With several copies, the nearest count.
Chain A
Amino acid sequence: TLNPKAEVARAQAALAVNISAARGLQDVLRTNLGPKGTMKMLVSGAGDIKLTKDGNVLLHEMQIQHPTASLIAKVATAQDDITGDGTTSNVLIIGELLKQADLYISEGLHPRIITEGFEAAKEKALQFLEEVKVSREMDRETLIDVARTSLRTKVHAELADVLTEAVVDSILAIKKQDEPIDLFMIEIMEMKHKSETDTSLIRGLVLDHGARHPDMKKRVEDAYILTCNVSLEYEKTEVNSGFFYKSAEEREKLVKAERKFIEDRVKKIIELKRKVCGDSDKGFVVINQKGIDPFSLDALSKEGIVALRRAKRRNMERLTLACGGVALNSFDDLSPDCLGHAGLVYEYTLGEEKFTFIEKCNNPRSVTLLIKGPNKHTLTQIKDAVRDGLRAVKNAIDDGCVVPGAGAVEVAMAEALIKHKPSVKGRAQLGVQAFADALLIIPKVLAQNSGFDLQETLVKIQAEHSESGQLVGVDLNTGEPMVAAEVGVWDNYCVKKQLLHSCTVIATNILLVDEIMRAGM
């Protein structure tokens, strides 16, 4: 009984397909959890190789064959946008909720009752986070432990010590006046021909194209930045005229006549240098974005001027906040208003290229984090670790409450839910028991990736109790119970709050699908 070119499962097998898809995806992403976890390889098919442990990158970029498992891949996209961490632990909890519910559904229990047990347990678990959150003020020592916890998972536990002081000092530079932190205030740059440990901090903005000319000053202590949008290269006639040439020699006469539009404007740059602070112990810099004719580069180099070309629109806006000079669209309007101020400006030297450093700006209200690595895929791996560590510190500053890590909260929530009786119906208790044992999967997986038994590690941390509030967690190296507060392992409150809210909504909709129908397939 059915129509041609149509397929539907009216029985509970529709749930058996969705649960089997979640259990399969659970086993794929469980091995990369924790800093001791294995790494996944991403092959683009064209020969590119990418290596990352980030759950969002693995689900977004890779393609999943099973249709239902692709819906969960879209969940990590909304999870990473609001918080930025916990996309891997999000899938592991959803896979366990559907596995624990399958045991009770096989006994004849209706899925609607189980979904009501998740909602009653969610309101109790979110209430528990308010009790164990720590109001401790953010300082340098706390941000190091938060940054180290986030970075240790994405690296080899070597660069983590180097990148820790880089991420913390980058956010503290843009933090002041209780202003909301903006990630657009920090720009990430990548460089080749260097080792991985050469990553450091840059106080100013880094530019790609540098000044190429033998007479250019290798370093300039002080100078006034002149912002210009105008190109000094060969351009079309800006007045009423045209290009008329009867031979090759006449065409050169048109070029010499056309260059006069640039030439008179180049002397305006020298006229401005001798105007404002044209005496000794002064300097001048040309940040001009568009191209510059080589004659202007040689003419300005005689006066001790460092000129730049081929910049970016976003960089020119960052340069403005560093100097304060106003962008100038016409050289006839040139005035001192377009002049800013800057500190030491020098040129770094690679084996091939050279970059310009504006470093020691007055009030740039921004910085630049500079990444160096021997390989291209290494730069991408580090860039993914930096943006992850920045949002971790950003969430710890924006929300002054932090929560312990290493599976300390999940084990504590599983104990409180067992002692909580449902206030709605008696059959809702099966939903609480399923959600209670689901939070325990996180400390279980941490034991597998560390090479330890799943049962022995869980029993020791679970049997640990006292007459006062105590925080126990899994120690990856030793395996014995460990206090997360004493060893400096912390997480973000907004991450754990959104984790419990996301896993409940997504796992509910999966159990609410009665029939899987093919339309036009």
Chain B
Amino acid sequence: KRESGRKVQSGNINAAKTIADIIRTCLGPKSMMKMLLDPMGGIVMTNDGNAILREIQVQHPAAKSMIEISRTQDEEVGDGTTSVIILAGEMLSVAEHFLEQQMHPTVVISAYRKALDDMISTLKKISIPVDISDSDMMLNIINSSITTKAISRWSSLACNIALDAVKMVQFEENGRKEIDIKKYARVEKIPGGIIEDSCVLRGVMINKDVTHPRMRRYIKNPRIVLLDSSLEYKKGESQTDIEITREEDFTRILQMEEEYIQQLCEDIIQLKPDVVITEKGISDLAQHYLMRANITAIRRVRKTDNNRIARACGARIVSRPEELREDDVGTGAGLLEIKKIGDEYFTFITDCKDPKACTILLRGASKEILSEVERNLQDAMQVCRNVLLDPQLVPGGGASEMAVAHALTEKSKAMTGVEQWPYRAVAQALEVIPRTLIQNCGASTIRLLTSLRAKHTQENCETWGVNGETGTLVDMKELGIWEPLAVKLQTYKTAVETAVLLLRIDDIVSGH
């Protein structure tokens, strides 16, 4: 029914620790696999940490908060999600100071919040800048996601696809350098071909099918008209349908239906465009006038899709077709191609101009390959987005967590009070990241982790991480595990904030 007292905070630990203990071995390139039993007897062997916790039914409420926060992390960054839950579970894994020591939660919460500002300032000291003009340096960065995949052969092509696409969407004049993949970077798939044939289309491609055989197949200078309203007989303010039981009245309603549709379509063809793009649907009587003009009929195009077309060919959005002016034209468009590609109808408005957006064309032999190439380029574009926002890299392979753990230990000597004990626990909680990398490789954990702490004490903390494949110690200047700083900052801010949120709840009450 409900829980109260120390059992809530002690229960929230076991709930968050149990969820974390599953994916502990899912981190790293050597990460172990898992087995899920379907209710019908099926088996899913996927090692992806996002798919595992998605199919697991969790009873405890705090266990749901661990999953919902990880799902939000996937939207912003498609990497490092597993590291968030491991750190969020390890920081809460030490219950000694929580209960046995009889310390008040706010005393411990103040320790994490002070340790959070120190973990952020340490990463900026050990970071390194990046030259975004050279595409060779961006190649080894993206290869982190490309490795152990089937696109490794086309990896050289996969880099140019994600790099040039994000650079177009990035608008640096505003000062915030905002990049939106879910709109301007929108991707569609093309059946047929091979992986090499995949290129980056400059423009906005529409998947609308060809309804009638009369359309413009190829145009040197396309003309595009953008208007929101649908082409139909004008109705009343309500949705009430028109019911006519008399034949004489049918001729009165049909004449009004043919007159208004022909009137709006007459003002559209006055400019003589090559296509008509409407936001809503298009009736059958309206398509009869569109096929007579020998122009392409396009409908069901959202607002964001229309905003990109207006900046591409120079179009203009008008509320009603009767108000269309000469300002709406498609002048400047490269070509218009309705030609069938891969047994599917495509539309190319592509041009020589950069309307803060583009379209990615995915070629492939089968739909199984298309699904593999798609998801592999998605996170690769997010890697390009995270680097262009903060062009700074931090050493990976566990070198970043150990470099911060050494700074927290040295600073705790000057801290005087009861908060020094939980403040040092954060330094030992960051060692779980290099620990799982060694355990998955098979090498001894205690022997290597002890010698690793001696390297950051003497040598520079920017190097000497942990090799995941081999298992020994290697510098990060000689290896490509360098990771973007924007990912590590979001990881530590989320791991600490989630651990604080669960400690603040001392009672679970059921009611509405």
Contact = CB atoms under 8 A, between A and B. Distances in A.
The answer to whether any beta carbons of A and B sit under 8 Å apart in the complex is yes
Interface of A: 1-6, 10, 14, 67-68, 70-71, 109-110, 112-113, 453, 509, 512-521
Interface in B215-261: none
B59 A3 contact: yes
8 A-B pairs closest in CB distance:
A110-B442, A521-B39, A514-B32, A520-B39, A519-B36, A512-B33, A519-B55, A518-B37
Contacts of B38: 519-521
B34 interface: yes
A297 to B, nearest CB: 44
A3 B34 contact: no
Contacts of A520: 38-39, 55, 57
Nearest to A18: B35
Contacts of B58: 3
Contacts of A10: 21
A68 B39 contact: no
Nearest to B18: A1
Contacts of B56: 3, 6, 517, 519
B299 interface: no
A518 to B, nearest CB: 5
Contacts, number: 73
Contacts of A514: 25, 32-34
B37 A517 contact: yes
Given A3-B57, A6-B57, A520-B55, A513 B41 contact: no
Nearest to A521: B39
B43 interface: yes
Contacts of B60: 3
Interface of B: 14, 18, 21-22, 25, 30, 32-39, 41, 43-45, 55-60, 63, 440-442, 444
B43 A453 contact: no
A510 to B, nearest CB: 10
19 contacts: A1-B18, A3-B60, A4-B59, A6-B56, A10-B21, A67-B37, A67-B41, A70-B43, A109-B442, A512-B33, A514-B34, A515-B22, A516-B37, A517-B34, A519-B36, A519-B37, A519-B39, A521-B38, A521-B39
Contacts of B35: 14, 513, 515-517
B232 to A, nearest CB: 36
Contact of B57 (A67, A109, A519): A519
A521 B37 contact: yes
Contacts of B14: 1
B107 to A, nearest CB: 29
A60 B35 CA distance: 22
Contacts of B55: 519-520
B57 A513 contact: no
A5 to B, nearest CB: 7
Nearest to A110: B442
Nearest to B25: A514
A355 B286 CA distance: 59
Given A1-B21, A67-B43, A110-B442, A517 B36 contact: yes
Nearest to A2: B18
A110 B35 CA distance: 18
Contacts of B43: 67-68, 70-71
B446 to A, nearest CB: 10
B32 A113 contact: no
Contacts of A518: 36-37
Of A1, A3, A109, chain B has the most CB atoms within 10 Å of the CB of A3
